[PDB]
Amino acid sequence: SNKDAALLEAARANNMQEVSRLLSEGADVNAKHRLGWTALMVAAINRNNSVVQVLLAAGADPNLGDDFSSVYKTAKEQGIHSLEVLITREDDFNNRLNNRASFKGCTALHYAVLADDYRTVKELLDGGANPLQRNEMGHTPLDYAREGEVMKLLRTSEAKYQEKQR
């Protein structure tokens, strides 16, 4: 309800104390914004490592995909005005992303890689996030990475996936 919306706002704010309280009051740990993203997603894109750990410890699914596509596609798909979609995505999710691109199926790991924050990536991988999972465009978290530790962290986890699969 409003408690699910309060969860997402606290996730954006990195307010771990508030996230834990709302979770204790029955907020859905996998609640989705009307435009299609989760609390773990909005925490990941904003480098909110503190809240990511709280969400993972409370059972958040790290492999869900954003139902948000682009301002253009989501405006038509859902029948909202494009300016409202753009403002909402910039204000309630992130304003440094190119939201003209397509994000459908992006997981929290996708967003954590786009933010170039090794700590959030490492925590998401320890929470069971699939580094081989593709978005609607077919891109994995690797495909969004850049030369650095984030790639290396991904490469070893991807290597361990082949090793530890069943």
Numbering used by the authors: 132 to 297
Text lifted from the article:
The human AAA+ ATPase CLPB (SKD3) is a protein disaggregase in the mitochondrial intermembrane space (IMS) and functions to promote the solubilization of various mitochondrial proteins. Unlike canonical AAA+ proteins, CLPB contains a unique ankyrin repeat domain (ANK) at its N-terminus. The ANK domain is not only responsible for maintaining the higher-order assembly but also essential for the disaggregase activity.
For functional analysis of the ANK domain, we determined the crystal structure of the ANK domain at 2.1 Å resolution. The ANK domain of CLPB contains 4 AMs and a unique insertion (consisting of 2 short helices) between AM2 and AM3. The isoform 1 of CLPB differs from the isoform 2 exactly in this region, with 30 residues more in this insertion sequence. (A) X-ray crystallography structure and AlphaFold predicted model of the ANK domain. Fitting of the crystal structure of the ANK domain reveals that the insertion exactly locates in the inner surface of the ANK layers. Interestingly, the insertion contains 2 patches of hydrophobic residues, implying a potential role in substrate binding. Next, we analyzed the dimer interface of the ANK domain by docking the ANK models into the density maps of the double-heptamer and double-hexamer.
